């Protein structure tokens, strides 16, 4: 399976999912780790939950690739490991909001 | 604290702590979760573990800043997101492995 045809999926699935601000960063000469990272916003935990859940379960149907899942059920972020292609979801009032809690210091 | 301040402080500690392949990808125009991404391999379980700790500590002593961390200390792989740049380390050899046993199918 084409890490283009991923790409493909990934961002369709997310696109259809009403993701918002769907980054494409090519990593080619820059990174090892991976082909592509896509970034994307969700509106909600549901959505964010949603979105993860649904991109996970397409990619296995399609590649048979069983996809590595960080951050859920608590879903103010999600980080899916897809191998060529890493996906991170986040909620942006929510990572604003925990951006100034560990900016003033919070939780250790 | 300055962003570009920040990326200086994170790619100065994994270079001093000898990652490799240490890449910067700005986010400017891109994607809203942060300013940077920065990528990076370690060559051992020791030294990925010993980059992170060291780098959320040095984080911390510059900024205040208490940084996330995912996937200690069970450290194939591990992300820090400290709000404005989020660091992923990898272990090249272990990713290699992990994601060819995703690929057939294995963990679900």
Redesign the interface.
């Known amino acids: 399976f084409d890490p283009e045809m991923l790409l493909k999926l990934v961002t369709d699935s997310l696109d259809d999912d009403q993701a918002l ?1 769907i ?1 494409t ?1 090519p ?1 080619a000469g ?4 991976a082909d592509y ?1 896509v ?1 994307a ?1 969700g509106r909600s935990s549901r959505q964010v939950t949603a979105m993860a859940q649904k991109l996970a379960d397409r990619i ?1 149907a399609a ?6 899942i ?2 859920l059920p608590a879903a103010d972020w999600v ?1 899916l490991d897809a ?2 292609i ?1 996906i ?1 979801l ?1 909620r ?1 009032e929510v ?1 604003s909001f ?2 100034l809690e ?7």
């Open positions: 601000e980054a960063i990593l820059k990174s090892s780790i990272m970034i916003s296995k590649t048979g690739y069983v996809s590595k960080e951050g980080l191998g060529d890493i991170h986040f942006p990572r925990y951006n560990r900016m003033w210091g919070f939780g250790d």
